[PDB]
Design an enzyme around this catalytic site. Structure first.
Site, PDB file in Angstrom:
ATOM      1  N   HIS A  68      39.520  -0.382 -54.564  1.00 34.70           N
ATOM      2  CA  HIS A  68      40.355  -1.551 -54.850  1.00 34.70           C
ATOM      3  C   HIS A  68      39.775  -2.450 -55.946  1.00 34.70           C
ATOM      4  CE1 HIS A  68      43.216  -0.909 -51.535  1.00 34.70           C
ATOM      5  NE2 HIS A  68      42.196  -0.222 -51.055  1.00 34.70           N
ATOM      6  N   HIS A 341      42.587   0.684 -40.246  1.00 44.49           N
ATOM      7  CA  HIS A 341      43.839   0.606 -40.984  1.00 44.49           C
ATOM      8  C   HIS A 341      44.852   0.564 -39.865  1.00 44.49           C
ATOM      9  CE1 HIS A 341      41.649   2.546 -44.417  1.00 44.49           C
ATOM     10  NE2 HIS A 341      42.422   1.720 -45.098  1.00 44.49           N
TER      11      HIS A 341
HETATM   12 ZN   LIG Z   1      39.642  -0.663 -47.648  1.00 41.65          ZN
HETATM   13 ZN   LIG Z   2      41.571   1.360 -49.566  1.00 43.39          ZN
END
Ligand SMILES: [Zn+2]
Ligand SMILES: [Zn+2]
Length: 404
Positions: A68, A341
């Site tokens: 990211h 996640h």
């Molecule tokens: Zn991450």
């Molecule tokens: Zn990621």
């Protein structure tokens, strides 16, 4: 009516090098700027060629993970980009430390020179740049992770970056017109947390009980400290394991510094980074232990295509030593998720709470993302009072929306 354009340059139908372009009423924004953990050099970069860095007004970074913000130093110190960049305080802090260690595209010098070009932003605080108002919510996932809500001419867009709802991600009461959300786990459903920690502990136990060396690859801190807490506790409840060391590179866990600073003896457990085993200690240990069936490795996080950890899960007959040597893979290989996640129920509930007319999926393997899209389309394909279009653009592909 005004036209809004969204285009992935990275993370389109893939996980890695998240970098999404947004264009609306004269403004241009970049969401994240990372590298692909499974690619080398310039090839591991988003397709920033398709754009002119000089035209980017705002650059928002969701969190500190490399996929990211891994390519930020490069973007900030080697392109015509003269816009403003924002991160949360913690994200920026870990940024310099993490990206530095990554320097084993740019150099240590470039990184230190970019810090000055990066502004920070507190959570729940509105900031304005070029007529673009933005603010962030807690994303869960990792320390400092943020979900940026963006507003331009009354149109609102929420970008989740990476998030978890298991610190849990906040669900904004402010409804966005557009939602860009990660697709990492697709339609998968995560097993009960207790069942997960039990299988993790029983697997580690099995390995050392048979005289094995147990390897647990982990990154910075995406779950590292949490796992150490689980093992230490388990060890406390099982006196028969008190003589088996647990190293981390607590009452039963000792810290390790290097493969030259620890004695690799009898059974033991070693938790080391990198989590995806591309290089470093985790990889050296793997190469030293892979030929013995008594040993075992437990992948505790999501692994991107192109990495050794991902390849290992395909259960290959042999592996490739960094030096090019061929070694047979005899150690056991197990996968127990702890990457933090959202799973399908969590993503589904999140989308149902916000009901964005437009949902754009990013950060997910092509096939995983296709099933998520279909399952989401199926969910609202029944009721005619809630219209939601789901998009899964490939890198370079643009999504076009008209407002007002
Ligand atoms: Zn991450
Ligand atoms: Zn990621």
């Amino acid at each position: 009516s005004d036209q809004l354009l969204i285009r992935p340059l990275g993370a389109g139908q893939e996980v890695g090098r998240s970098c999404i372009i947004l264009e609306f009423k004269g403004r241009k924004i970049m969401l994240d700027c990372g590298i692909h953990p499974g690619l080398e050099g310039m090839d591991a970069l988003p397709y920033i060629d398709l754009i002119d860095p000089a035209e980017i007004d705002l650059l928002l970074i969701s969190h500190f993970h490399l996929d990211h913000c891994g390519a930020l130093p490069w973007f900030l110190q080697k392109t015509s980009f003269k816009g403003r960049t924002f991160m949360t305080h913690a994200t920026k802090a870990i940024y310099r430390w993490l990206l530095s260690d990554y320097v084993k595209l740019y150099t240590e010098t470039d990184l230190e020179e970019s810090m000055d070009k990066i502004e920070t932003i507190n959570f729940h605080e509105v900031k304005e740049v070029a007529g673009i108002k933005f603010w962030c919510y807690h994303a869960g996932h990792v320390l400092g992770a943020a979900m940026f809500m963006i507003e331009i001419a009354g149109v609102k867009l929420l970008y989740t970056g990476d998030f978890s709802r298991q610190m849990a991600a906040e669900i904004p009461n402010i409804k966005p017109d557009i939602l860009i959300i990660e697709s990492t786990y697709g339609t998968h459903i995560h097993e009960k947390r207790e069942e997960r920690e039990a299988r993790f502990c029983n697997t580690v136990h099995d390995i050392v009980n048979r005289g094995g060396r147990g390897l647990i690859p982990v990154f910075a801190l995406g779950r590292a400290q949490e796992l150490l807490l689980i093992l230490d506790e388990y060890w406390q409840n099982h006196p028969e394991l008190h003589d088996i060391p647990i190293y981390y590179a607590f009452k039963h866990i000792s810290n390790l510094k290097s493969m030259d600073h620890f004695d690799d003896i009898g059974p033991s457990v070693v938790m080391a980074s990198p989590g995806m085993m591309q290089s470093g200690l985790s990889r050296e240990l793997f190469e030293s232990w892979c030929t013995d069936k008594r040993n075992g490795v437990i992948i505790a996080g999501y692994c991107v295509e192109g990495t050794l950890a991902k390849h290992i899960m395909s259960e290959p007959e042999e592996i490739t030593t960094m030096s090019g040597q061929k070694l047979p893979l005899k150690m056991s290989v197990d996968y127990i998720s702890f990457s933090a996640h959202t799973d399908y129920q969590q993503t589904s509930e999140f989308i149902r709470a916000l009901k964005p007319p437009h949902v754009i999926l990013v950060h997910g393997e092509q096939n995983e993302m296709a099933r998520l899209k279909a399952a989401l389309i199926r969910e609202y394909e029944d009721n005619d009072e809630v219209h939601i279009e789901v998009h899964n653009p490939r890198n370079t592909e643009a999504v076009t929306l008209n407002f007002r």
